[PDB]
Design an enzyme around this catalytic site. Structure first.
Site, mmCIF file in Angstrom:
data_model
loop_
_atom_site.group_PDB
_atom_site.id
_atom_site.type_symbol
_atom_site.label_atom_id
_atom_site.label_comp_id
_atom_site.label_asym_id
_atom_site.label_seq_id
_atom_site.Cartn_x
_atom_site.Cartn_y
_atom_site.Cartn_z
ATOM 1 N N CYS A 181 33.298 45.622 42.055
ATOM 2 C CA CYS A 181 33.374 44.393 42.850
ATOM 3 C C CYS A 181 34.595 43.550 42.524
ATOM 4 C CB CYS A 181 32.151 43.538 42.575
ATOM 5 S SG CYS A 181 31.917 43.359 40.832
HETATM 6 HG HG LIG Z 1 31.576 40.608 40.304
#
Ligand SMILES: [Hg+2]
Ligand SMILES: [Hg+2]
Lengths: 157, 157
Positions: free
Chosen positions: B125
């Site tokens: 992410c």
């Molecule tokens: Hg993250």
């Protein structure tokens, strides 16, 4: 690095495309905006010193780094056994084709694989040059980024 | 992304190595700090889902993006014509190994070449979850990053 939010990238990218700047660039063979309008493919006209070549730039947004990401690939014609043939230029040669001006390529070698196609992450410099302390100039970020990351090694003129 | 300056990365990395958090980690065969104390190599104990694999993690700093980079490769033993042999694992399988448990990778597929060796840049992410807001927690930041980028798919033990 720098940060420009995606909404800001998206908008400035469409605005840039609309401006006709790449369309009226004499170097540039054709311009393409992706379906999301997240990205822009530029195909440069045949260039020898800048045995001809064809250069492709894919302007994209990195959602991991929140910065534009300029993807590079180059078609070279090469005489093989006396026969003109086309191949995708290898990175170390891209590194020679260019430095001859702008001898510096930043960071680590980085191949981006796009649905089977191999691209070069182009990083002559740190994108942090483009922003000031307070991010006052955000509105022209993309335009100025274009000047630094594209026009600097392929002249507008 | 959430940027961290080289000075702070360098300190925290050396500091992280000192805590022996990786040395006492069960999965970890060996830990090496590069000559500059810039980067950290983790070799992991033989595993399959956690003929065995061997996973290597190189923790480095990107000067381009001012963010850490987790560089990843994997040795898999395959049985070829009935003979056990080793190979570097292909990214599709690195995905189908990690990606199943689970489950994500952000951005484009990025290959990093170190002096001829091939590494898959691992981004579960954006790092924007690690800090912000005048950054009173900056000092930890590498420790948070390790929790999100490493221990999440490996498991501390
Ligand atoms: Hg993250
Ligand atoms: Hg720059």
């Amino acid at each position: 690095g720098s940060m420009i939010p995606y909404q800001e990238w998206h908008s400035q990218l469409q605005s840039l495309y609309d401006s006709q700047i790449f369309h009226n660039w004499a170097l540039c063979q054709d311009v393409h905006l992706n379906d999301e309008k997240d990205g822009l493919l530029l195909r440069l006209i045949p260039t020898r010193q800048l045995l001809l070549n064809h250069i492709e730039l894919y302007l994209t947004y990195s959602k991991v780094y929140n910065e534009p990401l300029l993807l590079l690939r180059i078609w070279e014609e090469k005489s093989i056994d006396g026969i003109p043939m086309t191949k995708l230029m290898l990175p170390t040669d891209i590194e020679s084709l260019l430095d001859v001006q702008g001898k510096f390529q930043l960071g680590l070698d980085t191949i981006i694989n796009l649905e089977g196609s191999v691209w070069y992450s182009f990083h002559p410099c740190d994108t942090s040059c483009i922003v000031g302390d307070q991010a006052e100039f955000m509105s022209t970020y993309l335009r100025r980024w274009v000047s630094i990351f594209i026009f600097s090694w392929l002249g507008y003129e």
